[PDB]
Scaffold this active site. Structure first.
Site, PDB file in Angstrom:
ATOM      1  N   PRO B   9     -26.318  29.385 -24.376  1.00 14.63           N
ATOM      2  CG  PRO B   9     -27.271  30.448 -26.255  1.00 14.63           C
ATOM      3  CD  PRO B   9     -26.432  29.256 -25.842  1.00 14.63           C
ATOM      4  CG  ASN B  10     -30.559  33.032 -22.558  1.00 17.94           C
ATOM      5  OD1 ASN B  10     -30.242  34.071 -22.028  1.00 17.94           O
ATOM      6  ND2 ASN B  10     -30.814  32.936 -23.854  1.00 17.94           N
ATOM      7  NE  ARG B  17     -36.343  37.316 -14.080  1.00 17.18           N
ATOM      8  CZ  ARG B  17     -37.032  38.238 -13.401  1.00 17.18           C
ATOM      9  NH1 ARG B  17     -38.325  38.067 -13.141  1.00 17.18           N
ATOM     10  NH2 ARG B  17     -36.420  39.341 -12.974  1.00 17.18           N
ATOM     11  CE1 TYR B  22     -36.301  25.950 -20.625  1.00 14.43           C
ATOM     12  CE2 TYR B  22     -37.558  27.935 -20.088  1.00 14.43           C
ATOM     13  CZ  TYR B  22     -36.927  27.121 -21.033  1.00 14.43           C
ATOM     14  OH  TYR B  22     -36.915  27.460 -22.384  1.00 14.43           O
ATOM     15  CG  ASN B  76     -28.886  22.469 -23.451  1.00 12.09           C
ATOM     16  OD1 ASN B  76     -29.272  23.006 -24.523  1.00 12.09           O
ATOM     17  ND2 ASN B  76     -29.672  22.396 -22.374  1.00 12.09           N
ATOM     18  CB  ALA B  79     -31.547  29.817 -28.534  1.00 14.73           C
ATOM     19  CG  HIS B  82     -33.324  25.736 -32.372  1.00 17.07           C
ATOM     20  ND1 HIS B  82     -33.592  24.413 -32.115  1.00 17.07           N
ATOM     21  CD2 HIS B  82     -33.408  26.378 -31.182  1.00 17.07           C
ATOM     22  CE1 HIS B  82     -33.883  24.261 -30.833  1.00 17.07           C
ATOM     23  NE2 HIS B  82     -33.757  25.436 -30.238  1.00 17.07           N
ATOM     24  CG  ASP B  89     -19.741  23.118 -40.523  1.00 20.14           C
ATOM     25  OD1 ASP B  89     -20.413  22.129 -40.939  1.00 20.14           O
ATOM     26  OD2 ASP B  89     -19.651  24.166 -41.209  1.00 20.14           O
ATOM     27  CD  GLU B 100     -28.420  19.057 -29.764  1.00 17.66           C
ATOM     28  OE1 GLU B 100     -27.445  19.581 -30.342  1.00 17.66           O
ATOM     29  OE2 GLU B 100     -29.579  19.071 -30.241  1.00 17.66           O
ATOM     30  CG  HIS B 102     -32.365  20.100 -26.457  1.00 14.86           C
ATOM     31  ND1 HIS B 102     -31.904  21.380 -26.687  1.00 14.86           N
ATOM     32  CD2 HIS B 102     -31.987  19.362 -27.523  1.00 14.86           C
ATOM     33  CE1 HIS B 102     -31.298  21.421 -27.861  1.00 14.86           C
ATOM     34  NE2 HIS B 102     -31.347  20.212 -28.395  1.00 14.86           N
ATOM     35  CG  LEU B 103     -32.633  21.783 -19.192  1.00 16.75           C
ATOM     36  CD1 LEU B 103     -32.634  23.247 -18.820  1.00 16.75           C
ATOM     37  CD2 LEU B 103     -32.515  20.981 -17.911  1.00 16.75           C
ATOM     38  CB  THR B 104     -37.905  22.004 -23.094  1.00 14.39           C
ATOM     39  OG1 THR B 104     -37.195  22.634 -24.185  1.00 14.39           O
ATOM     40  CG2 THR B 104     -37.827  22.880 -21.866  1.00 14.39           C
ATOM     41  NE  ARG B 109     -39.988  25.395 -25.408  1.00 20.42           N
ATOM     42  CZ  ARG B 109     -38.973  26.097 -24.899  1.00 20.42           C
ATOM     43  NH1 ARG B 109     -37.847  25.483 -24.588  1.00 20.42           N
ATOM     44  NH2 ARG B 109     -39.084  27.420 -24.705  1.00 20.42           N
ATOM     45  NE  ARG B 113     -38.157  27.560 -27.910  1.00 18.48           N
ATOM     46  CZ  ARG B 113     -37.339  28.535 -27.496  1.00 18.48           C
ATOM     47  NH1 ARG B 113     -36.032  28.381 -27.491  1.00 18.48           N
ATOM     48  NH2 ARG B 113     -37.846  29.669 -27.065  1.00 18.48           N
TER      49      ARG B 113
HETATM   50  C1  LIG Z   1     -11.847  21.345 -41.146  1.00 19.81           C
HETATM   51  O1  LIG Z   1     -12.846  22.327 -40.855  1.00 19.81           O
HETATM   52  C2  LIG Z   1     -13.591  22.885 -41.860  1.00 19.81           C
HETATM   53  C3  LIG Z   1     -14.993  22.804 -41.856  1.00 19.81           C
HETATM   54  C4  LIG Z   1     -15.716  23.394 -42.914  1.00 19.81           C
HETATM   55  C5  LIG Z   1     -15.062  24.083 -43.967  1.00 19.81           C
HETATM   56  C6  LIG Z   1     -15.827  24.702 -45.160  1.00 19.81           C
HETATM   57  C7  LIG Z   1     -16.215  26.182 -45.074  1.00 19.81           C
HETATM   58  C8  LIG Z   1     -17.208  26.142 -43.968  1.00 19.81           C
HETATM   59  O2  LIG Z   1     -16.814  26.405 -42.835  1.00 19.81           O
HETATM   60  C9  LIG Z   1     -18.635  25.740 -44.282  1.00 19.81           C
HETATM   61  O3  LIG Z   1     -19.492  25.922 -43.140  1.00 19.81           O
HETATM   62  C10 LIG Z   1     -19.170  26.465 -45.523  1.00 19.81           C
HETATM   63  O4  LIG Z   1     -20.425  25.883 -45.798  1.00 19.81           O
HETATM   64  C11 LIG Z   1     -18.227  26.269 -46.755  1.00 19.81           C
HETATM   65  C12 LIG Z   1     -16.810  26.790 -46.375  1.00 19.81           C
HETATM   66  O5  LIG Z   1     -16.964  28.205 -46.305  1.00 19.81           O
HETATM   67  C13 LIG Z   1     -15.816  26.604 -47.504  1.00 19.81           C
HETATM   68  O6  LIG Z   1     -16.080  25.841 -48.466  1.00 19.81           O
HETATM   69  O7  LIG Z   1     -14.757  27.236 -47.402  1.00 19.81           O
HETATM   70  C14 LIG Z   1     -13.667  24.146 -43.928  1.00 19.81           C
HETATM   71  C15 LIG Z   1     -12.935  23.564 -42.886  1.00 19.81           C
HETATM   72  C1  LIG Z   2     -34.210  30.184 -17.990  1.00 19.37           C
HETATM   73  O1  LIG Z   2     -33.584  30.425 -19.259  1.00 19.37           O
HETATM   74  C2  LIG Z   2     -33.672  29.444 -20.209  1.00 19.37           C
HETATM   75  C3  LIG Z   2     -34.132  29.702 -21.511  1.00 19.37           C
HETATM   76  C4  LIG Z   2     -34.209  28.642 -22.420  1.00 19.37           C
HETATM   77  C5  LIG Z   2     -33.815  27.325 -22.046  1.00 19.37           C
HETATM   78  C6  LIG Z   2     -33.932  26.091 -22.955  1.00 19.37           C
HETATM   79  C7  LIG Z   2     -32.782  25.666 -23.857  1.00 19.37           C
HETATM   80  C8  LIG Z   2     -32.763  26.893 -24.699  1.00 19.37           C
HETATM   81  O2  LIG Z   2     -31.961  27.799 -24.445  1.00 19.37           O
HETATM   82  C9  LIG Z   2     -33.789  26.979 -25.818  1.00 19.37           C
HETATM   83  O3  LIG Z   2     -33.512  28.149 -26.615  1.00 19.37           O
HETATM   84  C10 LIG Z   2     -33.847  25.668 -26.630  1.00 19.37           C
HETATM   85  O4  LIG Z   2     -34.864  25.719 -27.633  1.00 19.37           O
HETATM   86  C11 LIG Z   2     -34.146  24.441 -25.735  1.00 19.37           C
HETATM   87  C12 LIG Z   2     -33.078  24.324 -24.628  1.00 19.37           C
HETATM   88  O5  LIG Z   2     -31.920  23.754 -25.290  1.00 19.37           O
HETATM   89  C13 LIG Z   2     -33.461  23.242 -23.636  1.00 19.37           C
HETATM   90  O6  LIG Z   2     -34.582  22.686 -23.627  1.00 19.37           O
HETATM   91  O7  LIG Z   2     -32.572  22.895 -22.842  1.00 19.37           O
HETATM   92  C14 LIG Z   2     -33.378  27.121 -20.743  1.00 19.37           C
HETATM   93  C15 LIG Z   2     -33.295  28.163 -19.833  1.00 19.37           C
END
Ligand SMILES: COc1ccc(C[C@@H]2C(=O)[C@@H](O)[C@H](O)C[C@]2(O)C(=O)O)cc1
Ligand SMILES: COc1ccc(C[C@@H]2C(=O)[C@@H](O)[C@H](O)C[C@]2(O)C(=O)O)cc1
Ligand SMILES: COc1ccc(C[C@@H]2C(=O)[C@@H](O)[C@H](O)C[C@]2(O)C(=O)O)cc1
Lengths: 157, 157, 157
Positions: B9-10, B17, B22, B76, B79, B82, B89, B100, B102-104, B109, B113
C-alpha cells in the site's frame, strides 16, 4: 468546496444493532443531517459520501482525492483507527485537511481502542458526541478551508 | 525465470508525496530501473510487477504464484509488514524464495515500524537503500535460484 | 436451518502445503466431511461455504447474514483472529450464535497467535482438533439453536 466523507467498517450497521453506545440513527440519517447543516448554513459545500468495510478501499479513496476536486476529508475509520498504519500513511500523503470522527469516546472503552494511528496523522480528532460529531467536523472543515484560502490571498500580495 | 515483484500500500504514491525518506522517483521508474538492471547484466529474468493497497490481493497473488511460472518473489509489503500475520503465513506457504525490500531503514523510524512479521517469514530482508534495494534483491534472487538449481542437478547424479 | 461457514485467509491452501500442524486434507474435503456429518445425522441443516483472504469480505458476509434466514455462523478467521477488531465488532452485531474454530491449538504456538479478538466476541471457541473441530462446531450449533427455540416458544406461554 467538495468535501469527501469516509465511513469505515460496520458503520453501515448503525441503527440496526447495539443502542448502548450507538442509539438507533442510521448512517443514511447522519448523512441527511450533514446535508441540512450545509443547506441551512448556506455553505458552498458539496458532500460526497463513501462507506466501506475494506481497508484497501479506504486507502484507494484517499489516494484518488489527491489532485482531485476535493479540498478536505472527514473520516471515521472505525476499528481500523486502532490498527491501520497503512490508512495513517495514506492520510499523511493526502496533502489536504483530514478530520477524524468517532461516535464514541475511545478514551473511555477497551484498552485496545485507545490508540488511534489514523487520528495521530489527522489534524484534529473529535470523539464522543455521537452523530453531532460529524456536524462539528463540517463546521471545522469550513473554517479551516476559509482560513487557508484567506491566508493564501494575502500570500502572494 | 519469471520473478514476481509485489508492491504494497501507498507505494504507488511515490514521487507524488514526501521527499525526505522517499525522494522523487516514481514506482514506474523503479520498475524501469529494475528492467535496466536485468539488461546491463544480461540476467535470464522476466519480471512481472503488481501494486495494491489490499492485504487480500497481496495474499491472493502470493497464493496464485504457487505451482505457477514464478520462480521467486520480491516483496515490499509497505505498512502491512508490521501488522499482517496473514501475509506472513502466505509467504511461509509459497514454496519458493521470497525477499523483502524496504525503501527506508525501518530500524531507524517510529517504534511501530520496527517489527516485520513478513520479513521474518522471508529468506532475507533489505532496507534503507531506496530504489536500489530492488536491484540488490534481484541479484540475490538469481544467485539463490542458481544454487537451488545446481544442488538439484547434482542431487540426481 | 441454513448455517454459514466462513473460512479466512490461507485456509484454501490446506493440503497444498505444511503437514506439521495441518496434515493433508483440503478445504473442499473438510466441507464434504461436514456435509456428511449432517446427512448421516439426518440433521435439518443447509450448509453454505465461503472462503476469502479479505478482511472486508468476511465483514460483508457477516453483515449480509443480519436479518437473513441464516441462523448461525461457524468461523475460522485464520490470522485475522489475532488482529481484526473490525471482524470482532461485526461478530458482536451478528444477532446470532457464532462459533470460532481453529485447526491448531493457538495457546501452544507463537506468542502473537495467543490473543483472539474474534474468539472473545464469539460465544464459544474450539481449537486444536484439526478438521474434526468443524464437526464439533456443527454439533454445538445444532444443540444451541434447538435450545434457543425450545426457550422462545416456552417463554411465549
Ligand atoms: C496451509 O495454510 C495454512 C496456514 C495457517 C493455518 C492455521 C490457521 C491460520 O491461518 C493461523 O494464522 C492461525 O494462527 C491459526 C489457524 O486459524 C488455525 O489453526 O486454523 C492453516 C492453513
Ligand atoms: C509516498 O508514500 C509512501 C508511504 C510510505 C512508504 C514506505 C513503505 C511503507 O509503506 C511504510 O509504511 C513502511 O514502514 C516502510 C516502507 O515499506 C518502505 O520503507 O519501503 C513509501 C511511500
Ligand atoms: C453497530 O455498528 C457499529 C460498530 C462500532 C461503531 C464504533 C466505531 C467503531 O467501529 C469502533 O471499532 C471504534 O472503536 C470506534 C468507532 O470508530 C466510533 O466510535 O465511531 C459504530 C457502529
Amino acid at each position: 468546496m467538495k468535501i469527501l466523507v469516509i465511513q469505515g467498517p460496520n458503520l453501515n450497521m448503525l441503527g440496526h444493532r447495539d443502542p448502548r453506545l450507538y442509539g438507533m440513527v442510521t448512517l443514511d440519517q447522519i448523512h441527511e443531517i450533514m446535508q441540512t447543516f450545509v443547506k441551512q448554513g448556506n455553505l458552498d459545500v458539496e458532500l460526497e459520501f463513501f462507506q466501506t468495510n475494506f481497508e484497501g478501499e479506504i486507502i484507494d479513496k484517499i489516494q484518488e482525492s489527491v489532485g482531485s476536486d476535493y479540498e478536505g476529508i472527514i473520516i471515521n475509520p472505525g476499528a481500523f483507527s486502532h490498527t491501520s498504519i497503512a490508512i495513517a500513511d495514506a492520510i499523511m500523503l493526502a496533502g489536504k485537511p483530514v478530520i477524524e470522527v468517532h461516535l464514541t469516546n475511545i478514551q473511555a472503552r477497551e484498552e485496545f481502542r485507545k490508540n488511534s494511528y489514523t487520528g495521530a496523522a489527522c489534524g484534529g480528532v473529535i470523539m464522543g458526541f455521537g452523530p453531532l460529531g460529524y456536524n462539528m467536523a463540517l463546521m471545522a472543515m469550513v473554517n479551516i478551508l476559509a482560513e487557508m484560502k484567506a491566508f493564501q490571498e494575502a500570500q502572494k500580495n
